[PDB]
Amino acid sequence: MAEYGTLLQDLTNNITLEDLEQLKSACKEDIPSEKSEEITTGSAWFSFLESHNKLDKDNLSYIEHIFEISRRPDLLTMVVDYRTRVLKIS
């Protein structure tokens, strides 16, 4: 669970308010309009997403895509890499 916590945080370190806009732009259909509005922090979007069941402690597929579709593969990579490294660790 925790490592995932840093994972969200790692992309969050790389997340600019602007980066989020782009992810939101990608997410416009999936993440509700009302909510996308108030996404002024990387953690906020996770914490929203977490609050709704579009992201477990294990589940990433929702966000993985978002990072794929959005032209910001650093974050994707962190999700991908996390999935893997933690897989190899566990």
UniProtKB/Swiss-Prot annotation:
Modified positions (Phosphoserine) are 61, 90
> Could you mention a single GO BP entry for this protein?
apoptotic process
Give the disulfide map.
Answer: none
The source's domain of life comes to Eukaryota
Q: Does the keyword Glycoprotein apply?
A: no
Arranged from A to Z, the UniProt key words for this protein are: Apoptosis, Cytoplasm, Phosphoprotein, Sugar transport, Transport
**What does UniProt give as the signal peptide span?**
none
Compartments it resides in: Cytoplasm
Is Cytoplasm one of the keywords UniProt gives this record?
Answer: yes
A GO cellular component term found in this entry reads: nucleoplasm
Q: Mention any additional remark.
A: Increases PLD1 and PLD2 levels, possibly by stabilizing the protein.
Q: How does it assemble?
A: Binds RPS6KA3, MAPK3 and MAPK1. Interacts with CASP8 and FADD. Transient interaction with PLD1 and PLD2.
What is this protein identified as?
Answer: Astrocytic phosphoprotein PEA-15
The scientific name of the source species is: Mus musculus
Name of the gene? Pea15
Which residues of the complete protein appear here?
1 to 90 of 130
